[PDB]
Design a protein around this ligand. Sequence first.
Ligand code: CLA
Ligand code: CLA
Ligand code: CLA
Ligand SMILES: CC(=CC=C/C(C)=C/C=C/C=C(C)/C=C/C=C(C)/C=C/C1=C(C)CCCC1(C)C)/C=C/C1=C(C)CCCC1(C)C
Ligand SMILES: CC(=CC=C/C(C)=C/C=C/C=C(C)\C=C\C=C(C)\C=C\C1=C(C)CCCC1(C)C)/C=C/C1=C(C)CCCC1(C)C
Ligand code: SF4
Ligand code: SF4
Ligand code: SF4
Lengths: 81, 73, 138, 69, 74, 161, 730, 74
Amino acid sequence: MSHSVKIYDTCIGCTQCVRACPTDVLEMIPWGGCKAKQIASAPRTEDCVGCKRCESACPTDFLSVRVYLWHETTRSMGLAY
Amino acid sequence: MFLISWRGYWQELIETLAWAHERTPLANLIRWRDKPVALSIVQARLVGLVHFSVGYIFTYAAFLIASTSGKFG
Amino acid sequence: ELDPNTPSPIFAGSTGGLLRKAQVEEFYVITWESPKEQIFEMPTGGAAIMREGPNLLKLARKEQCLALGTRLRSKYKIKYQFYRVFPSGEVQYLHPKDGVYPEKVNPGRQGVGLNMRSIGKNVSPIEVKFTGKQPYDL
Amino acid sequence: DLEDIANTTGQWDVYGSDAPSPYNSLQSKFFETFAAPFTKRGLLLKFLILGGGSLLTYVSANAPQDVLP
Amino acid sequence: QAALYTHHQYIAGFIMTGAFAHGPIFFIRDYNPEQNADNVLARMLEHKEAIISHLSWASLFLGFHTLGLYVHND
Amino acid sequence: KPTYQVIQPLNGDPFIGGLETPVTSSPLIAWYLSNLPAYRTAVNPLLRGVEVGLAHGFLLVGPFVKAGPLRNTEYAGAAGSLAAAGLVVILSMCLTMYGIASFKEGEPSIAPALTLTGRKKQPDQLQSADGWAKFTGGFFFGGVSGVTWACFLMYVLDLPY
Amino acid sequence: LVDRDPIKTSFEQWAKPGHFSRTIAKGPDTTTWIWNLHADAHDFDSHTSDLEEISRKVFSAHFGQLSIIFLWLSGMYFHGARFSNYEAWLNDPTHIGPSAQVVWPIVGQEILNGDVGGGFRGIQITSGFFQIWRASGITSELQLYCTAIGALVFAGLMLFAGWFHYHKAAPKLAWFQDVESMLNHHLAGLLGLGSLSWARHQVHVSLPINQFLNAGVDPKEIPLPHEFILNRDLLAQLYPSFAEGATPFFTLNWSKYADFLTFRGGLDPLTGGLWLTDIAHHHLAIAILFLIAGHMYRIKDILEAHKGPFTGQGHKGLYEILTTSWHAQLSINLAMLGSLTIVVAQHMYSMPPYPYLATDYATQLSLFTHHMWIGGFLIVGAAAHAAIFMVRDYDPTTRYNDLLDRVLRHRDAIISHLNWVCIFLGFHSFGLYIHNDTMSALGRPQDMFSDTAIQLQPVFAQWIQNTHALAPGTTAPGATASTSLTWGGGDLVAVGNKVALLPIPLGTADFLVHHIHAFTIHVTVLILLKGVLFARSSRLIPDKANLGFRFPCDGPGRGGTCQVSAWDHVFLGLFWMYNSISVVIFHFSWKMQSDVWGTINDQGVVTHITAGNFAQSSITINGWLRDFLWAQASQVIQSYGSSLSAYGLFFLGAHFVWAFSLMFLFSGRGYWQELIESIVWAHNKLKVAPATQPRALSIVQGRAVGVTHYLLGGIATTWAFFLARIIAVG
Amino acid sequence: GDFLVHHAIALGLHTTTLILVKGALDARGSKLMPDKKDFGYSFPCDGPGRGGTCDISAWDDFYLAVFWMLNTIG
Ligand code: CLA
Ligand code: CLA
Ligand code: CLA
Ligand SMILES: CC(=CC=C/C(C)=C/C=C/C=C(C)/C=C/C=C(C)/C=C/C1=C(C)CCCC1(C)C)/C=C/C1=C(C)CCCC1(C)C
Ligand SMILES: CC(=CC=C/C(C)=C/C=C/C=C(C)\C=C\C=C(C)\C=C\C1=C(C)CCCC1(C)C)/C=C/C1=C(C)CCCC1(C)C
Ligand code: SF4
Ligand code: SF4
Ligand code: SF4
């Protein structure tokens, strides 16, 4: 929000867990203690489109994201062209 | 359509169908001011409906009348 | 173009990539290394070859030009590299910045993950009515 | 080498983007302002959409003795 | 008399829905679990899984039992 | 000389589409189209206006004088103008309020010639509103008018058929 | 898997949860995998990453079709035998109205069983045995009762060839992965040696045993069970024992003959099923070719050859992988097999090949729409399976820069055109009709599009029809009539019960249906074409070959990102074709009865099932339920309490089942979840649910249970609508 | 004749409302979508995976509702 879908979980470990999703997610930002110690929910999200490929894999244990962003550029949908 | 169509298929051939103009003479430069797209993923659940409905409600409309009027009853 | 002909990523024709909206706005382009002359797969449907130069193909939009990876790393190579071209220069230094390979640690940059309160009992709906004085612009 | 014909006239070649017709018939400024009022276009169109379109429809619908629907 | 019972049957049905549809918006934009609880609008939420079931049990019954009687009859 | 030009996808780089085949860029065609607003903007849009207005003008006659709503007319105001001196008018401001997607507000006058043009970045726009006027103004006097040496021309006709 | 692989157990795998991708069906319980298992049961991305077997399965689990087609047919020959009516009907055709099936009078049943001919209670037929069966250079009920077990013979055996594959330790690669000969064989001697062999048992025996049937008798007052050997003495009536000729060639004299054949064209007065005196010659004249033809050849060579400038460099090399595909060499086939079935559906009705058809109306249109839905249900397929290619089949990308890599090169292109094609059609191809309504309901005919208002004038004629029935005066030899009696020029006299075929006139109301077909055939194909083409990659998703050719929809983003894929292009392309065929049918019978079918009496004053109501009145698309749907169908909704009744009595269900599809077609998915739990809750209180985690339908399963229903609904609806307006007047 | 339609107008507002009751009785969320909120109503769609998730906004049940209000009221 403008890209606000929560995939968070609690492990935020990313080995045999989740990577998939065009650019958007440059994480591994180890918070001071969370097991395989890499955490949070995103990096700078003003770049790419609206997947839920975002979970599909590696837990969000609650929801999982999808489209919810509304304010929606174009670069933010393939088609501005 | 709206109802068994689902934005994906529509948008994509509009991706090919907006390679026309841009690539065809006597219809170049000629700019849209709104970027050709396919209907939102809630919007068309509505529109098929708000469409399903008039048809439907405009059919009994004309059905009953068109036969309670003649009759015989 | 030709009088300047500086190419790298072989192709021939195609009604696929780049068209009007990559001048009038933004540009997007990927670059890479490679060993010896190899035939690839391509975004936009087609398919060609490699060898070198910069190995610098230009690409319509950046979801398009990382898929060299989603297969173009099932075909050897550390190094592949896409930036952002404008119609004039910079800010948005795309695969530039710091480190690379989304899954390491130098800094933390953005992200956060929480909103105000965390995933916990937001059976609590939408709170205040949106009013210019209580920290809900984030 | 006979069929090496030194490209029987090179051409130059590439004609051009250069220059394969002069231009547009001299008929022009034989309309100079002739028909202006879209050549006085300096604020108009609102005028021609009451006017023109009240006389493609005023008399255009009315008629003195039907020849009906 | 017969294109006038119905523009009042359409609508009327057409309402009801919208009725039922702004009382599933209260629960999201407005509503306030900490401010309503033990409280009988809650409990209505809380003891909800039954509510749709002892509803769905009506339909499924009201389903095949109307439809035995009408094919059988055909 | 070659297999077909120095063999090329586009002017040059093959990462733009166009797939320059014939029907695209054969000197056979690309010259049948550039006294007009194909590659280069001759004089201003001013004059092109009426060869455009007019040519497209005396069309739309037998379309709506031989396929007219109750057709083959015995009314001296048809086999020509009749109404259709409506289309040109319903569309001679179908245009003007598209030249409101052009503003860019100037007055240079460069329909006279200087140094072998290019108009350079001539692509994209680079035709302001005070251009698109003198064209869609050429349009009206090309549409309405181009409708009458249709009409005015008696009609000797064949076919057919 | 893992289990015992080895070498170390005959002991078969009955017991231990799962199999089919690898954090498989997991220990942990669920339901989805029970539609999994049946769906995709046949598939190949699992079983093994290695060709080999698969062709070793498909050549077996193939087999069990033939065997089946073979258990089937038996119960049809048996059926078309001792549940008789065939004996009865044949001495007595023009008269009967055939049966094979009959109930048993349990519960309500019997109404379904209603006097059909040679004196018995039963349910009719629109499946023209009793008419292949004319054949029987023999006749006899117990006889078909041999042809019948002759059937079960081929089966058990042509079904133990399927034991005698996969399960037996199998052939391999070379065997098919040398293709070199295959069609060499197939077309030469079977294609040939059948048509050939069929010749020999198509004048020998059949011709004579209906040469003197087309008159009277009661069988066995004709055609013994052996009689037709060496005895070349009854072959005496139907030409020479060659008299003085020896193995054709020329030093032959005809002062008065020219062997059987003596080419016909037209229609027996007394049995207008087209002449048989021909039917030998044409099958003979086939086989030869096949006989000569199946004698190529060995492959590339011929395709590794003709290229050009813009043409197909890759033409040359058009697939090593056409010995390494299937999914490819199936999809090609379906387009042909399929497209080569509904070409039947014409040459049939405008050229009957069996004795008593046309007169038999309903027993060859059933046909012309059954055959019609395969020459379509097999074509969308013929696309699906190409999509299945286009996505996956090969190992890597070894296939390169060719005819395809070409076509794709353009792709936002071949489908860029085709599109506008359709909206040009549609506007010229349907709103065309809508004019009429809007202006005939406005009402000013002066200006409709009538076969008479918009300029066309009491003739259609001058085109090519009129240079077909009239061509027996070219290089043409001749033979009274034409080729297909339905052509412009000459002749009338066809049949002495009811009618058969005659000219079939055109212009408009033939002009424009013929065009709706265009636009219908076209936009069908758009969606399959662009569907299979954009199979794997795109500028809505390029990371888009990453699972399979199905996948639900990529994800809420990009705007829509739902339908895409190509399971689904082969989901909305069925959706059309159901029309494509469903309106072509609608066409034929409304013609074929509005004109043609109808009837002679004195001065043969013709009396169609309908005095051409078509005329001015299909042109209105209401006329299409004024004159059709509301006109005919009055036999469906009158049909209660009768004998056929099972149609009207279907026509409500299946005219229900369709109106159940929409629920499967039109709805979400975490919906029936969100619902399936409320349920699951009430379940747990009594202690009655959890085990086998009950789950809603697999996004695309859901679409699977659309579509399939929408068709078996929307279709048998007319299958009923029909048989109910040809049985009984017509 | 009336002891059926009269049970089939009864199978309408019941079914129509198991869906509206339901539609409503969690625009809030549930197991498949737990935290279904801050926007509740028309968020139509969600990503594939979890079980496969769709017309599971309280709007799209409203959306879905309006077919039976168009089948009772008929
Ligand atoms: C009698 C009144 C009543 C009132 C006072 C409101 C008031 C409101 N409704 Mg609402 N609603 C009602 C009845 C009412 N509703 C009923 C009966 C239904 C269904 C039975 C709904 C279903 C509904 C939905 C889904 C939503 C609202 C929403 C809203 C809010 C925004 C309105 C909006 O989105 O319109 C803007 C609409 C337009 C400007 C026009 C587009 C509407 C389309 C669908 C046309 C509909 C059919 C049309 C007549 C056919 C075309 C005509 C043809 C002859 C050409 C507002 C609070 C929104 C909301 O805020 O919820 C979160 C939204 O979600 N309503
Ligand atoms: C005519 C229609 C068709 C049928 C048969 C149904 C039936 C049903 N719908 Mg439904 N629906 C439809 C079209 C249909 N819908 C359409 C077009 C839409 C909108 C696009 C919807 C939107 C909708 C919603 C929102 C809901 C339903 C629900 C239901 C169920 C409600 C319970 C009930 O009525 O009794 C039960 C069912 C029947 C009387 C139908 C017959 C089912 C049995 C008798 C099958 C026959 C068995 C047969 C002998 C074996 C054949 C199978 C095979 C072995 C050959 C019911 C299964 C609701 C529900 O889930 O209830 C819990 C609710 O979710 N529908
Ligand atoms: C030569 C042809 C033929 C063959 C051998 C195949 C073979 C195959 N197809 Mg295929 N296909 C064909 C023609 C053929 N197809 C045609 C004509 C079409 C167009 C419709 C398709 C459309 C198609 C699709 C979309 C898919 C396949 C897939 C497949 C593969 C999956 C097989 C499977 O599990 O069975 C599937 C059959 C069932 C699970 C049985 C269910 C049948 C139901 C729907 C009943 C039909 C209605 C009927 C009236 C019901 C019986 C009566 C009842 C009322 C009592 C397999 C390799 C699938 C794949 O993923 O590739 C690997 C993919 O799903 N095919
Ligand atoms: C073994 C044999 C044979 C044969 C023959 C044959 C081998 C024949 C066959 C034929 C085939 C056919 C004739 C086919 C048929 C088919 C059909 C009939 C089908 C039909 C159909 C269709 C149309 C499609 C689908 C469906 C159906 C199936 C119905 C023989 C051999 C031999 C030898 C060595 C020795 C000496 C003698 C001889 C003789 C020389
Ligand atoms: C209600 C019902 C039924 C209904 C039904 C209906 C209401 C409908 C149905 C339908 C079905 C179907 C329909 C199937 C089928 C089929 C067929 C056999 C087909 C065939 C065909 C072909 C071949 C192809 C196409 C065409 C046609 C379709 C013809 C039932 C109910 C019930 C109950 C009470 C409880 C218990 C169970 C039961 C007893 C069950
Ligand atoms: S839950 Fe997802 S991405 Fe989140 S922390 Fe784990 S894998 Fe990282
Ligand atoms: S889930 Fe969202 S952020 Fe993540 S990749 Fe997809 S679109 Fe990007
Ligand atoms: S599945 Fe549902 S959600 Fe997913 S994409 Fe399709 S529609 Fe959207």
